[PDB]
Design a protein around this ligand. Structure first.
Ligand SMILES: [Mn+2]
Ligand SMILES: [Mn+2]
Lengths: 184, 184
């Protein structure tokens, strides 16, 4: 089936099309701007985004929101991971964490799917630590400094397949797929 | 005249009621949640906020949005100053600016006013530098580490009167007042 993915993030599109492609699902990206509200949880951003988008883009469609929540920084940058990456970047994060006892953190992803007048959400979380130096060229954003608990490579040192297997977005996708299998 | 100020920030209410009180204008705070969109300019946040609020709160009303834009950090934290203050705080800023050549930065404030079916905006900007240590107990947020160009005190070391005289919010208020005098 064909699902329109409303996003302007090339990275997210690669990981998503790739994962869902495996199961014969066609993902077509469509850059259509929508408002992402300031909120404490990604879920609120997804809900509002889908509410605003319905009727303005082709169906069925999906959108995603994700972020890196760092414990020592009280969940920061979290929901505003994108903005923070663009302004202070990885350097900005590493500097904020120089001599940080615990570099524990988690990545969260929320997928909103709209179809037949109804919206559904799927999420996945993955903990890890912030490396001390960048590493890798794959992925995007904070992938170069995030080591998912259960390995020694950063998201950036993994292939799309290797990432979707441990990543937060990988779990949201698995969850979202399970749902599709049972409803469509 | 009576103007309802939709906000949950005690600080902003004090500076605003105080300034406008001087001219015989009654400011009544009303905590009513509204969506603040993620955007590059405060003006966009104000526009969307007023659009959503009209019809849900008493008129006439105003809302404000403001932020600290630090040059060395590419305008960060800017629009998300509130969130950043709550998570990494002043310490987080100072750490990001240790050994920063230029500590130049500016505070911006945007006031949205709705009345008779129409919305109007007023803004004010004020440059300065980020001090090396906190200072003062007045004000709120980043006031303890911001020294407005043209003095040696931080916003926190000033009284409400002294702040409204140099502050970014003080200018938005003057602008907003000039407008009132000419229209009402
Ligand atoms: Mn987002
Ligand atoms: Mn705001």
């Amino acid at each position: 089936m064909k699902i329109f993915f409303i996003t302007s993030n090339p990275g997210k599109v690669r990981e998503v099309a790739n994962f869902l492609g495996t199961f014969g699902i066609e993902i077509v990206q469509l850059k259509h701007e929508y408002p992402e509200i300031q909120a404490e949880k990604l879920e609120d951003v997804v809900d509002f985004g889908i509410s605003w988008l319905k009727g303005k883009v082709p169906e069925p469609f999906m959108i995603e929101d994700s972020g890196l929540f760092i414990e020592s920084l009280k969940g920061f940058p979290g929901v505003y991971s994108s903005y923070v990456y663009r302004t202070i970047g990885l350097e900005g994060i590493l500097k904020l964490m120089e001599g940080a006892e615990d570099r524990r953190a988690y990545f969260k992803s929320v997928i909103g799917f709209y179809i037949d007048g109804k919206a559904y959400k799927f999420s996945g979380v993955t903990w890890g630590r912030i490396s001390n130096e960048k590493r890798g060229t794959h992925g995007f954003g904070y992938d170069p400094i995030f080591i998912p608990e259960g390995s020694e490579k950063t998201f950036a040192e993994m292939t799309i397949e290797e990432k979707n297997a441990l990543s937060h977005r990988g779990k949201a996708l698995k969850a979202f797929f399970e749902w599709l299998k049972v409803n469509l």
